[PDB]
Amino acid sequence: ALERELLVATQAVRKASLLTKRIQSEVISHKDSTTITKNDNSPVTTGDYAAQTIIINAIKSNFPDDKVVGEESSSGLSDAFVSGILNEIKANDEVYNKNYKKDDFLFTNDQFPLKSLEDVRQIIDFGNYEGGRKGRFWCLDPIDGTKGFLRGEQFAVCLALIVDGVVQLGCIGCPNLVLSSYGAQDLKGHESFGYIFRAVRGLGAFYSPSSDAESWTKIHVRHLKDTKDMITLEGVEKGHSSHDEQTAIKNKLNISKSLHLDSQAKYCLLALGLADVYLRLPIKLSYQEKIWDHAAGNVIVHEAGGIHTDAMEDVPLDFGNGRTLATKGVIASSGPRELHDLVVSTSCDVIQSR
Ligand SMILES: [Zn+2]
Ligand SMILES: [Zn+2]
Ligand SMILES: [Zn+2]
Ligand SMILES: [Zn+2]
Ligand SMILES: [Zn+2]
Ligand SMILES: [Zn+2]
Ligand SMILES: [Zn+2]
Ligand SMILES: [Zn+2]
Ligand SMILES: [Zn+2]
């Protein structure tokens, strides 16, 4: 099941992970020209578009009819901005093909040659699918954690395949993730562009240095019993999650130790067994989480033996509702069920007491 799809996912994430790692400092330096404020006031950069371009072009070259829910859109981008996207893709190709080329794998072809500005626009815009309850589609956040990217910190490149509303396959590139920062040992080859994490439903979760992506090491959550010894994972950005209510949960459960970082790299650390509980409570209850912020993590966490629900009702997340999740917030943990249920019911109670 889904062998070709996993190869495509992995290689697409891999090449985009190299590009985003390499361009990060330049994007930061040239923020006035490389960064755009979208209509929700969130940032998008040359790197986000370049990653979306590489990944969707790779999907379409290998699966021409496939549907994609991608975060970004080319509408309104100027030709100059698009030429910059294309140039970064070709600069990356020159490094990538020297060093990391995968035999018998195509990123582009006759139909999708990725040569012109119009090609770039077209490819970005294949991410305009609405998702939903039936059928197969890909789900992409080309740079998850753009704010973290722009702070020179953690971010992730995130791709998933959903079939009939269920995430079947996930692949997360964490180009800046150094495991020695999180207690753990790094693997040979990590230094160039971080790690890739991946999973297929029913087949396990694995990781590899991005530069490798051939030798895969199986991962599983850890199981601490002394909750007081547990570590939470939370976002850094104050406006992405209710950090004060999250702290309330922590106080109440005596879970003092804290890691903060942007992106679905958090799910990767949970799945690797370096932390225990991920908390993302909504500040505003009208907010609907985007599926691309959670899909890849969902299957990776599942396959690593963890639990993934909303933050109030303790129900599994439903990836067949369209581009958004209908529930409120997200909580993931190592389990077991009783611990997970405690965390979620504490979250519910904190939110109800507002
Ligand atoms: Zn450049
Ligand atoms: Zn449609
Ligand atoms: Zn993004
Ligand atoms: Zn995101
Ligand atoms: Zn964004
Ligand atoms: Zn090293
Ligand atoms: Zn915190
Ligand atoms: Zn287990
Ligand atoms: Zn439960």
From Swiss-Prot:
Impact noted for substituting E237K: Increases levels of lithium and sodium resistance while maintaining a relatively high specific activity. 5-fold decrease in affinity for PAP
Cofactor: Mg(2+)
Binding site residues for adenosine 3',5'-bisphosphate: T146, H240, S263, K266, R280, D293
Keyword check for Thylakoid: no
Variant or mutagenesis effect after changing V69A: Increases levels of lithium and sodium resistance while maintaining a relatively high specific activity. Increases affinity for PAP
Cofactor binding, per record: Binds 3 Mg(2+) ions per subunit.
UniProt-listed CDD domains: PAP_phosphatase
Annotated Mg(2+) 1 binding sites: E71, D141, I143
Active site feature: D48 (proton acceptor), T146 (proton acceptor)
Record protein name field: 3'(2'),5'-bisphosphate nucleotidase
Organism in which the protein naturally occurs: Saccharomyces cerevisiae (strain ATCC 204508 / S288c) (Baker's yeast)
